Structure formats: structure tokens, C-alpha cells
Design a protein around this ligand. Structure first.
Ligand code: T6J
Length: 435
């Protein structure tokens, strides 16, 4: 695997031991060969699990999620996918890694897709090797891969709202269930219904995942209600997955706004990763996978692949060259390579809007490419009437940094800034000049 111009897809089935068995073998061999190596974890939770798999090996943990004192001598770096892409974008030296290892390499967040594009381009240029570790490579059509133990697969209607009757099988279960929902708001309603029926429920989403995931170890629970973030190597001691088979798709309409379309079917890869939370224990056959819909290739035209192009157009590779998306996922977007390349000062604004601003890539781009500076929040209030953001059926209002109460009406409307209470709270803080 460790030869220049090699990209290997380590596509062992879920729970086959890619992280705990294969990865330390790869790392020892890379250290022996003096390959400057990066290991990319999708989440801080996975970064911490990797430390345990790699214990004793000379690895530099570029994450506050791991407590180790380093030698200062490590040639193997470990960081999150997002951290890698973030450092590429910033005016900071990122080593030209000889070996690039991406764990949970199916992750479809923009920074992960961009990292795969940058890495696969360096490999194609002859410069580097790469290993993408996932059961579900891009364009996989198999929602029912092999498992450590046999799984009971049943197609069944799954509730997406509070229910009173007709789903006794949901609550009649005495074990632990991981339930994939298409959104935080949908999980909130299902969670409230289960809590009312006497169940102990933990909810996981991107913003809450590190903190809340620890509850699955520290407290007794009957259900975990999770969005798609638990597709990325989250492990549970569960004997059932309930899968809505639904997700939200961010969609750019007319180059001018982002909507959260759906819910609509998941990809085959997502469905296989959802299912792959169970069947992991060869001593516990008969884990259950209950699924409420079919799959479709909903990554086609999904904003994350266009956002990935906005990131890659703004990453230095060599002179004016621009990294391509990883070939198997390159047709998910219709973009002109280089169309999103920004001049130095607009690029700095773009980066700050994503890093400090915590804005979605697409929205950060609209603001930065308009020539607006990071602290100029006038655009949060001068949109068309149909861009008015609503909070509990009334227009959302903030006090501007000038001390004026104004209706939140952004010039560019991206649905992700108000997809749940937490998102809108964060965007209100932004519009007010509070970060
Ligand atoms: C024990 S340490 O030296 O803080 C490990 C480390 N090295 C880093 C380099 C860049 C960013 C974070 C980093 N954390």
C-alpha cells in the first residue's frame, strides 16, 4: 500500500477491524519506512479511539481530544478531517505527507470531500500514497454488506412523528436501539414520544456529538436518536438499529439560496453505515435492522460537493493548479474547476467566516465574494422579504451591534443557519456582531 502514486481503498466490511487491527500495522510499517504520515479521524471521538489502537506508537495528536505528552520526534500526525482542510486553507505550513490515511473515508461533510480531492490529486501527481478506510466507498450500491454476526433485516414503516398506536414493535423491545432520523427537529419529536412512553433517550447531532456521545457510555439508555453523524464510526453496545432511511439534502437553488430539501432517501453507503452500527459482535447474532424506506443517490446535486469545490479552489496545490475531487465522487457536482478561486483578502474573509463565523461554506463564499469584510453584518438585514427568518411563527429579531432591533433577513438565505433552535441562536449571535 505504501508505494508512491498508490491510492488503496481499504473496503473491509463494517467492524472487520480496519481501525483497531489494520491501522496500527500500517503505522508501524510507515514509521519503519520513514514516511511522514497523516491519519485523519472524522471526529474527536474517533481520534480518542485511535489513540487507544495506536497506544505506544510515536504519533503526534493534533487535537485537544487526546491527552499525551509527545517526544517532539513523531513523523506520524493524527488530526480530524476538518482540521486538515482548515490548515490547508490557512496561511500555515502543512507538510507534504508521503502517506495519507483517511479513516471513515465515506464522510460527506464538505471538508472531508475536499480532503479526499486534495489527497487523491497529490497521489495522481505521483507525489504521495493514500489509504481510504471505509466499508462504503463512493458509488457503492450495496446497502446490506457483510457483518461480524448475522443481521435480521426487515423493511417496516418507521414513525417520523409522535405516535399513539400501530408501532408496538418499537417500544416492545427490551434491548438498546440506535434510531437514525433525518433532522434534529424530527429526532426531538420522536425522542419526546419515547420519553413519554418511559424510555431513556440520548439525542446525537453534529453540534452535540462529542459531549452527548459520552452519555452512551456513562448512563443507561434504551434509545439513541441520532442524525447521520453516527454513520462515521460511532460505536454503540446496541442490538437494534431503526433506520428512517431518510436525510435532508442541502440544495442550491438558482445559485442564490440553499434549502434543506426532503426528507428524502439516503444513499446506499449511508444505509450500509447505519445498519453497520449493529451485527458487530460475532458472539451476538440476531441484531435487528428495521428500515423505513429505499435508497437513492441523493448525493447527486447535494450542496456538500459544490462546497467541497469552493474549498479546493482556495487551497494552494502547485502554481495555478487546482485539486480535483476524488474521481468516484467528482460527478456529484456541476462546477467549473477554479470558478470559486478568491484573491488573497477575499480568501481570508471566506476562511474567517467559516472558522470564527461558523457559517456554512456556501454562505461564507457568497459574503466573501461580495467583497464584504468579516465584521460587516449589514447583509444579515438587507435581504428580500422572502429571506425573512422565522422563530416560533414570528420573524426572528436581534439587536444589531448599533443597538437597533432588526428583523433577521439575510441577503443570502442558507436554511442551515436556522435548521433548529441551536443553529438560529448561533446565527442571531453572528448577526448581532457577537463573534
Ligand atoms: C502535545 S502537543 O505538542 O500539544 C501535540 C500537538 N501538536 C500540534 C501541532 C499543531 C496543532 C496542534 C497540535 N497538538
Amino acid at each position: 500500500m505504501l508505494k508512491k502514486k498508490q491510492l488503496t481503498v481499504l473496503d473491509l466490511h463494517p467492524g472487520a477491524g480496519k481501525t483497531r487491527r489494520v491501522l496500527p500495522e500500517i503505522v508501524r510499517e510507515a514509521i519503519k519506512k520513514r514516511l511522514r504520515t497523516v491519519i485523519l479521524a472524522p471526529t474527536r471521538v474517533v481520534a480518542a479511539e485511535m489513540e487507544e489502537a495506536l497506544r505506544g506508537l510515536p504519533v503526534r495528536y493534533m487535537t485537544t481530544a487526546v491527552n499525551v505528552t509527545h517526544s517532539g520526534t513523531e513523523i506520524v500526525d493524527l488530526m480530524c478531517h476538518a482540521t486538515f482542510t482548515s490548515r490547508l486553507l490557512q496561511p500555515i505550513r502543512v507538510p507534504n505527507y508521503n502517506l495519507n490515511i483517511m479513516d471513515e473515508a465515506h464522510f460527506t461533510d464538505p471538508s472531508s470531500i475536499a480532503a479526499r480531492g486534495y489527497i487523491s490529486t497529490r497521489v495522481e501527481m505521483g507525489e504521495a500514497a493514500a489509504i481510504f478506510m471505509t466499508a462504503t466507498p463512493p458509488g457503492t450500491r450495496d446497502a446490506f454488506p457483510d457483518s461480524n454476526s448475522p443481521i435480521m433485516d426487515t423493511e417496516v414503516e418507521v414513525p417520523e412523528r409522535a405516535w399513539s398506536s400501530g408501532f408496538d414493535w418499537v417500544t416492545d423491545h427490551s434491548g438498546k436501539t440506535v434510531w437514525f432520523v433525518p433532522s434534529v427537529r424530527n429526532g426531538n419529536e420522536i425522542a419526546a414520544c419515547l420519553t413519554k412512553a418511559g424510555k431513556r433517550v440520548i439525542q446525537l447531532s453534529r453540534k452535540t456529538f462529542e459531549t452527548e456521545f459520552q452519555k452512551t457510555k456513562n448512563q443507561e439508555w434504551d434509545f439513541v436518536i441520532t442524525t447521520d453523524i453516527s454513520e462515521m464510526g460511532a460505536n454503540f453496545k446496541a442490538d437494534r438499529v431503526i433506520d428512517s432511511r431518510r436525510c435532508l439534502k442541502p440544495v442550491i437553488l438558482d445559485g442564490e439560496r440553499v434549502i434543506l430539501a426532503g426528507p428524502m432517501p439516503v444513499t446506499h453507503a449511508s444505509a450500509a453505515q447505519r445498519r453497520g452500527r449493529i451485527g458487530r459482535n460475532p458472539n451476538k447474532p440476531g441484531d435487528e435492522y428495521m428500515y423505513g424506506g429505499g435508497c437513492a443517490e441523493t448525493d447527486e446535486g447535494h450542496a456538500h460537493w459544490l462546497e467541497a469545490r469552493m474549498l479546493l479552489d482556495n487551497i494552494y496545490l502547485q502554481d495555478g493548479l487546482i485539486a480535483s475531487l476524488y474521481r468516484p465522487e467528482a460527478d456529484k457536482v456541476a462546477a467549473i474547476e477554479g470558478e470559486f478561486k478568491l484573491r488573497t483578502e477575499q480568501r481570508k474573509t471566506f476562511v474567517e467566516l467559516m472558522k470564527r463565523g461558523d457559517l456554512p461554506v456556501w454562505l461564507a463564499y457568497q459574503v466573501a465574494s461580495a467583497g464584504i469584510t468579516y465584521t460587516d453584518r449589514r447583509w444579515c438585514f438587507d435581504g428580500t422579504t422572502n429571506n425573512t427568518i422565522m422563530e416560533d411563527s414570528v420573524p426572528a429579531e436581534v439587536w444589531t451591534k448599533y443597538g437597533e432591533k432588526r428583523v433577521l433577513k439575510p441577503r443570502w438565505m442558507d436554511a442551515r443557519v436556522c435548521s433548529d433552535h441551536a443553529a438560529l441562536k448561533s446565527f442571531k449571535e453572528f448577526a448581532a456582531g457577537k463573534r
